[PDB]
Amino acid sequence: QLNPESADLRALAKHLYDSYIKSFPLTKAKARAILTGKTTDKSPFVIYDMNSLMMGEDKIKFKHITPLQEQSKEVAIRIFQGCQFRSVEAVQEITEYAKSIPGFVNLDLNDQVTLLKYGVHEIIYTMLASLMNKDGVLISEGQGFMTREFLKSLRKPFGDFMEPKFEFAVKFNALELDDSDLAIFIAVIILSGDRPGLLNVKPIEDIQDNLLQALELQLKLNHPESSQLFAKLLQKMTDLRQIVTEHVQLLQVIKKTETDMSLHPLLQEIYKDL
Amino acid sequence: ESADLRALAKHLYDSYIKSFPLTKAKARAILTGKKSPFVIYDMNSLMMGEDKIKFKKEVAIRIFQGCQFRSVEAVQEITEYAKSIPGFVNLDLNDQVTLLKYGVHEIIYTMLASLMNKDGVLISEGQGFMTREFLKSLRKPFGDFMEPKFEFAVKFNALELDDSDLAIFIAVIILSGDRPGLLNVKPIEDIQDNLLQALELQLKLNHPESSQLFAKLLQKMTDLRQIVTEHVQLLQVIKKTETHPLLQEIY
Numbered sequence: 137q138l139n140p141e142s143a144d145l146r147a148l149a150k151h152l153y154d155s156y157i158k159s160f161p162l163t164k165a166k167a168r169a170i171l172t173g174k175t176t177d178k179s180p181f182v183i184y185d186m187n188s189l190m191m192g193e194d195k196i197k198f199k200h201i202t203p204l205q206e207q208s209k210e211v212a213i214r215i216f217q218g219c220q221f222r223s224v225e226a227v228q229e230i231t232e233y234a235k236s237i238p239g240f241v242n243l244d245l246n247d248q249v250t251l252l253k254y255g256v257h258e259i260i261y262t263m264l265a266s267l268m269n270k271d272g273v274l275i276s277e278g279q280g281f282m283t284r285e286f287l288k289s290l291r292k293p294f295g296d297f298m299e300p301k302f303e304f305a306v307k308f309n310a311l312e313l314d315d316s317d318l319a320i321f322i323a324v325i326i327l328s329g330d331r332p333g334l335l336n337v338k339p340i341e342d343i344q345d346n347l348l349q350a351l352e353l354q355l356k357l358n359h360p361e362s363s364q365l366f367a368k369l370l371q372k373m374t375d376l377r378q379i380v381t382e383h384v385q386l387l388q389v390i391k392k393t394e395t396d397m398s399l400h401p402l403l404q405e406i407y408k409d410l
Numbered sequence: 411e412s413a414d415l416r417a418l419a420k421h422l423y424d425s426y427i428k429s430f431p432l433t434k435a436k437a438r439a440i441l442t443g444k445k446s447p448f449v450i451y452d453m454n455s456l457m458m459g460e461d462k463i464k465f466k467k468e469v470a471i472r473i474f475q476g477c478q479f480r481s482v483e484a485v486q487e488i489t490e491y492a493k494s495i496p497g498f499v500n501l502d503l504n505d506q507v508t509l510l511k512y513g514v515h516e517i518i519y520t521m522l523a524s525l526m527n528k529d530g531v532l533i534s535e536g537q538g539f540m541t542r543e544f545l546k547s548l549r550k551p552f553g554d555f556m557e558p559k560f561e562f563a564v565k566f567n568a569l570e571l572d573d574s575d576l577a578i579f580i581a582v583i584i585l586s587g588d589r590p591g592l593l594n595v596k597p598i599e600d601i602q603d604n605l606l607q608a609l610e611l612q613l614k615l616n617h618p619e620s621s622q623l624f625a626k627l628l629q630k631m632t633d634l635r636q637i638v639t640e641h642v643q644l645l646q647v648i649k650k651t652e653t654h655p656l657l658q659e660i661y
């Protein structure tokens with residue numbers, strides 16, 4: 137028996153899911169379909185070693201997930217550049233989703249920037265989980281699949297970047313959330329009134345309160361038998377924070393060890409004084 | 411069902427009152443001024459407060475030290491409270507130890523907030539009040555080993571939780587199924603699930619006004635863990651300070 141209040145919350149949930157589908161080309165629904173089973177070109181090419189990687193570049197439409205060179209001795213840096221490029225693209229998608237969140241574009245512009253600066257990576261890790269399973273991660277719009285073991289065997293620094301994400305993913309995936317759930321959750325993440333440097337926290341907390349309300353209802357309707365999923369999901373927010381912290385440290389190592397590499401401008405600004 | 415929830419809530423509250431001498435209610439009365447505590451706002455006041463209060467060279471160090479003594483006491487109070495939580499004592503013994511080992515820091519800061527305001531913190535059963543600025547004026551990195559707690563506290567206290575709310579929240583923190591090294595995660599999550607349901611009802615019945623307070627409180631978990639990790643890093647760096655054997659053992 138939908139009430140007048142719960143009615144508006146359902147409308148918000150629908151709106152967000154709609155914008156999510158429109159803003160993110162590769163949904164968890166598609167990722168799962170690729171990862172589990174089918175025959176259509178949905179089957180990804182699997183990269184689990186140097187030779188398969190070499191053939192991957194030939195098979196997979198890596199149209200652009202590689203800078204201007206390839207014979208860069210180590211594949212470690214080629215993967216680095218590719219992952220970097222995808223993140224920038226993800227920031228772009230998340231930024232577009234954000235503008236669809238009711239009230240977000242009406243907030244002070246400096247705060248819009250602050251909210252995006254701190255929320256984008258937490259969102260990136262949340263959604264990256266949709267593309268992972270305990271054995272690897274979908275890449276190049278789902279065309280390829282790079283194994284966890286392969287990524288772990290990379291040169292000293294690089295071989296330590298992905299594991300923490302996989303550990304978070306296997307755990308987060310156990311909540312069995314679908315795209316309709318995630319659309320609201322990522323909205324909640326963005327409208328965080330506790331981000332450093334925010335000018336007007338009040339209007340932001342008001343928007344988040346309504347999102348939380350929407351998320352609460354969504355999880356109870358969509359996952360009836362999942363006791364306290366709402367609270368379990370909210371607690372996952374601490375895991376995302378840690379991933380970021382740790383990630384930043386690994387980045388500082390790369391910056392010093394690899395003088396010939398550099399973070400993309402967008403990413404640099406995001407991490408500056410974080 | 412909702413019957414067991416309020417019963418659980420009452421039980422936890424009663425137990426919390428028995429285990430924790432200085433309650434938030436108590437502390438607030440003393441803080442807002444409603445037998446004024448001795449105030450330590452500088453060196454001489456501290457030195458005076460010592461021969462007056464009798465708490466139980468290098469001030470910055472003696473202070474940080476005092477923090478430790480109280481922390482150790484707090485762990486015992488927390489441990490006793492833990493045993494009153496339904497299901498806790500029935501858990502694998504090693505798991506009980508793991509949950510306490512990783513949960514006392516989070517609980518310590520959570521309760522520390524009850525005794526703080528943006529200007530200072532109550533010490534020794536509330537007999538004293540040490541200034542935020544005095545603490546913030548200590549040499550070395552000591553002049554900021556408490557500041558992060560004050561910052562958390564100011565933010566945490568905005569939620570206006572009371573002892574009955576905190577009792578259930580603390581129990582939730584203790585029953586965290588994600589602590590490393592746990593042997594049987596299931597019972598732990600099942601108890602926490604129960605505690606979470608009790609905390610939600612408690613917040614809905616105790617604060618009809620505050621929308622999504624449950625969600626907001628759970629979100630503060632992020633701030634506690636971040637403050638704890640940061641507290642650990644500070645403790646290490648401190649080592650670079652070269653200024654008992656049984657003492658070190660106790661702490």
Ligand SMILES: COc1ccc2c(c1)c(CC(=O)O)c(C)n2C(=O)c1ccc(Cl)cc1
Pocket residue numbers: 212215216219220223224260261264287290293294295297298301390403
């Ligand atoms: C979304 O999760 C990740 C994981 C790793 C990342 C990034 C993002 C970004 C982009 C960003 O952080 O904005 C960079 C630059 N990463 C690397 O350093 C890296 C190094 C070696 C390998 Cl094999 C793979 C990736």
Ligand SMILES: COc1ccc2c(c1)c(CC(=O)O)c(C)n2C(=O)c1ccc(Cl)cc1
Pocket residue numbers: 432472473474475476477480481484517518519521522525531532533534535536556
């Ligand atoms: C929850 O576990 C703790 C840990 C540390 C604590 C307190 C409580 C309290 C609250 C209380 O003791 O009632 C205070 C004031 N703490 C201090 O930081 C401190 C610092 C220097 C000295 Cl000399 C004495 C105490």
Ligand SMILES: */C(=C(\CCC)[N+](=O)[O-])c1ccc(-c2cccc(C(=O)O)c2)o1
Pocket residue numbers: 198201214215218219220222223226260264273274275276282
């Ligand atoms: C890093 C993340 C980025 C998520 C937005 N990810 O798991 O996709 C990452 C790991 C692996 C790659 C990657 C993508 C595309 C191509 C390659 C390659 O080595 O050719 C690697 O990005």
